Amino acid sequence: IPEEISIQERHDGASREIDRKTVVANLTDAFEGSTIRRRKLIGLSFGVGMGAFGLGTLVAFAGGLIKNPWKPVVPTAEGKKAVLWTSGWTPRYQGETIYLARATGTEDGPPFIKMRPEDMDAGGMETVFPWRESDGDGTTVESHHKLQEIAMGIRNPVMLI
Amino acid sequence: DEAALAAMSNQELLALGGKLDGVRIAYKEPRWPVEGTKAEKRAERSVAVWLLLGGVFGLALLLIFLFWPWEFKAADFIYSLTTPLYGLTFGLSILSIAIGAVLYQKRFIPEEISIQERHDGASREIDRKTVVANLTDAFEGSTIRRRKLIGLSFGVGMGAFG
Amino acid sequence: LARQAEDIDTRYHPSAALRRQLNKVFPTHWSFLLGEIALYSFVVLLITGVYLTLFFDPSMVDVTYNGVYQPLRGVEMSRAYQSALDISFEVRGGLFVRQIHHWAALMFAAAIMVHLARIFFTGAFRRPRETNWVIGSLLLILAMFEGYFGYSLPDDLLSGLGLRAALSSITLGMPVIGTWLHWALFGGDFPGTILIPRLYALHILLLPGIILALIGLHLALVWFQKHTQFPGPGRTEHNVVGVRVMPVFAFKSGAFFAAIVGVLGLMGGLLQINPIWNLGPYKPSQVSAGSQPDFYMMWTEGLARIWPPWEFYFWHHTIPAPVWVAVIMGLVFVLLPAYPFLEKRFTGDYAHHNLLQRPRDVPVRTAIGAMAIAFYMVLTLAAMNDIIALKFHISLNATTWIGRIGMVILPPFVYFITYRWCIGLQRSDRSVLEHGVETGIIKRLPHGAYIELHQPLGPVDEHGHPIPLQYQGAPLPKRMNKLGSAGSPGSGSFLFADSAAEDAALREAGHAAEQRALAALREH
Amino acid sequence: LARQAEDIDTRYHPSAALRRQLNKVFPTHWSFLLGEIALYSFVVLLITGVYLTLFFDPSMVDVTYNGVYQPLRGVEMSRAYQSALDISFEVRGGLFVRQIHHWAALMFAAAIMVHLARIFFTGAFRRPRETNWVIGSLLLILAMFEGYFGYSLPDDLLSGLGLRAALSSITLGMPVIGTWLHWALFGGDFPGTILIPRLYALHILLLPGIILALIGLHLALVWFQKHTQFPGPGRTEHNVVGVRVMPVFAFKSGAFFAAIVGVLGLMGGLLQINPIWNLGPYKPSQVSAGSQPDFYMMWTEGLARIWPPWEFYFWHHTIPAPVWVAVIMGLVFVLLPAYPFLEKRFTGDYAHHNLLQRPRDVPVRTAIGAMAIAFYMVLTLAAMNDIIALKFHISLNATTWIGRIGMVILPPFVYFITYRWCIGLQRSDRSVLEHGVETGIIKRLPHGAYIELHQPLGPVDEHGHPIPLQYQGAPLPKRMNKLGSAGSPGSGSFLFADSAAEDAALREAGHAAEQRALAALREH
């Protein structure tokens, strides 16, 4: 392909004065032909209506995401508390027995099994989860779903060293 | 078309600009040639009524959206009114705004008639000749017209890759 | 502010382009707003859809509801249906927004159909703008398919049945490819774990983007190639009559957009539509009279219903009836963009035109349009068989046979009728052009005769008979009160009259303005 | 073909504007292609993302794998991870395509960073193009956020941990609003059933569309406002030197696009990236040293790591440490578009400029750029502390302290060093301007001296010492071989020479052509 060199002649900078004058005159005539400059009430009403409609529309649009992080939804032993104040270890009827069940990783066997003090070592690290014996083993659909729910909890896991 | 264009009337400046853009305007007349009359005041009151109605309906929409019982309890006479009331308020508000705008345009904005002067049809011959010459020199300068092997290889490679 | 304008002009120096675009003139006519209606509907669809995407979950894994709607508690169901019920009942106002979305989509379909019909009637599809017509046809087809994909995402049993029937039957019925296409689309058998996510992605990503880009292309083409105009006094094949953009045209467009948003909101909030909660989750073993999907693809269902059962059997193979339905719909697809070339080759006309033709001047094209619209209407109403036989006590078989004979015997009748109709309209226009406007006043003529007292529209002969004019395609006032007939009442508003001087001055100003306008238009 | 061109001309009448744009001249320099690479990478991301959407399923309902990967059979897992595994292993070449997508995203990030650096160095951000700089800052921020959302859809341990830490801690740590934003985003607690679908929708629909529209706007602005150019022999503030479009510009762009696609494909096929199958499904109880997310937001992680633990406790309230990190990142966001205003109100310069400045000419701006780049590099390398201590046996605490102290002590050192470096470069340029460029040849001078034998670059005085020239901001050769002294060896290809006449003719033709080009450029 042959090589070439060319010059563009930018013609940059401010526009030609005639075009500016024509545009300014056209805009000024269009704006002042409406005679809205001498109607304060009409402009005020238009502004108030536009503002009210805009605020209402945006509030309605944004209303689908607002939730209260402080409403009592989780039942407890002292009434109902917000999610952020609970971690799944709170007793529910004032005297529940919760075992520090450890994970197993097997499907046929229960996902969690009870823990004995003798089954530890001088430098053993283990992971435990709340059991809540009324849950039951993973046989029925409800029990399996409850076990999965207790498994998926951010503030649930606890170390025992 | 001269530096003496300063101190020039707005209407004639607009006409000159239209001439540069090829648009001639006829019958540009104000909607109220007569001086201030009670008819114009009645018209402005009427157009303001629609805007006030739109604002009031928007405020009512905000109030109902903030303070309405919308949780399901049907098993009430009120839960069956959330969506209808929302739609009613929204439509009334913006429809009042629209009708106010159209009435203001119709009874206040002056009418006009203009001509465009299409300049349709085929382009000017000089432009066609210049474009044809540019394209021909660009293609002929490539010299590929006398290279069958290069073009064939390029086509085969492009087809195989595609 | 002057400072900002000066800075912008010094920086970007946009003067000529702004002046060139701002001084453009648009034709003024009520029929010319039937595209902005569809574009505003499209804007509403996009805004609602971009809102709804924040509360959906397209999954086919079976789950339990245990939500708020008590009658549906403890029923295994699709996750997507659960998300749809959530946005319909649990989120404040979600039902309103989704109903607005659906109603706006229906408005979009109706508006595009009406706009296409108007364009076909006006005959602007000639040589200068045929590519625009092809683009419009492709837009219609893609919009129709995307809308068909619309009501299927909340996979209730009704939408599930519709998509099952259509896709599974037609795709598997292909004579040659057949099973390959269906297995590619669904990933195996008909009920697939990937069908809903694929449909969701296709409905939100590819088709809307292609549609928006092609709409932009269509608008650019109509922007560059100047719009046509109806014949009139100051109208000619080398100029355009209308209004400038800045003072009027944009303001009217904004007002119209606000008005359509208002009517959409009002009617969407007033009318319930697609109550999925009343329905149930889709299962293969549940079926009922719930049928007749959305009305803008309804012709395919009607054609499937009406077709006679013809089948062919050769060596270990079988081609079912619906293949004919596929052939017919493909032929309808092909014919829509091929019409301009067919007409050009049939009539042998290769001339440029910037002036449209009124509907009563071209009998053949109007007859073909009546042909097509009658065929579409009879196809649409044929598949309303269940509702028609239910509301009105009519036999289902009887209505089916009525349709079966109608789509073949009705078309020629309306074709001939509309041909005669156009000829009669042309004859009436010629008769109006011959004599004066019928004033509806009769005189006794003491010698004993009754006359009509025609009002001539122009020059008359020495004997008082109007000099005949020449037809030019311009509309004429059929009623006397349309033209002249000075009868404007007093200057009051509703209860109190104004000053006589004010009324006289206003009457003089109005008469002078109208006379000056008509004189300027006629002289130009 | 002639007929098609004639029809096109007769229909749309485009010749003038087409001739206008087709005759546009673009500047020629290697540094001017660092945006085309980013645009081509963006095209690659778009096409791959269009492909990937046909096999994904964003659902958080727990399922079982029971697929083909034996070491992962029978494990409770999220649906999206199963779909990702399906795309990686059970589709012919899907892993290749997703690897191409990820590598292309990294390509895009690196390209945009390099392009921004080159723009900042050249100083084209002055008055004529400030809005372009603001748009570029917005593009960088939006692209960085989109890239952050990218690697999070296949919710493995790495992505889950990263999103959990960043989003949960930062959003919940907001002093005033805090929990409201987190609950709005996640719909309640952190692990939500709607989080992943929302992220998927935001990654496919909103951000890509906004990015594409803004990229088109930036390209249009750089198209209208003519590109700058380096100072040179035939260059001035009222003209542009380069090549036309048709024979060179588009062809080079296409070749570069093909080459970038080639390097992306090669390096994607060679290098494994993000092996999610080696990872596991996300659970709150699994965690390890897996950290340090994608390298274009790694600075936020480093800032979180190095920040000292300062906290404030007043009446039943507590503001944690990461709020300072949020303040720092917000200020970094704010400063990026506000730099040109600060410079123009600090130096008091309000003049237009179409010619750039070479980096060694302006010491202060280069020093500030070195400041910023050194800060970014030291912050980025701090977050990679674990790999530093692992591959190289170094104390973790020692490396953390080194990063902490260096964030304060290193910046001034490099600032001063680069200031001295720029001053020295200016001094060297002045010195090479004063005398002839060194030829590297010495002479014995029988009387007993040694001379450099400078080669003058222009006019020479009566004494043989070239008269001083003037600096014009133009680069000058520093080596003899840069200028034509002795080159162009024999006309053979690799083993056999050609005829002497042909070689001589080629040599003289090349010399004549180069001399003619230089004379034409210098005179004009």
Ligand code: HEM
């Ligand atoms: C452009 C033309 C479009 C048409 C004709 C259309 C049509 C429809 C229809 C009829 C439904 C059924 C609604 C229902 O049964 O309640 C639907 C659902 C849905 N569409 Fe569209 N839509 C369009 C654009 C979009 C866009 C732009 C988005 C997202 C950006 C979107 C996302 C959705 C979603 C998330 C749903 C589920 C909500 C629901 O079913 O109620 N659609 N669509």
Ligand code: HEM
């Ligand atoms: C705007 C620039 C984009 C960025 C920064 C981005 C970022 C990412 C990243 C980092 C990944 C992970 C790749 C991998 O794991 O192999 C990804 C995957 C993906 N992206 Fe994008 N993406 C972008 C554009 C798009 C577009 C336009 C689409 C299509 C609408 C898309 C859809 C996807 C899909 C479906 C995946 C799944 C593939 C996978 O993760 O393996 N992305 N994206």
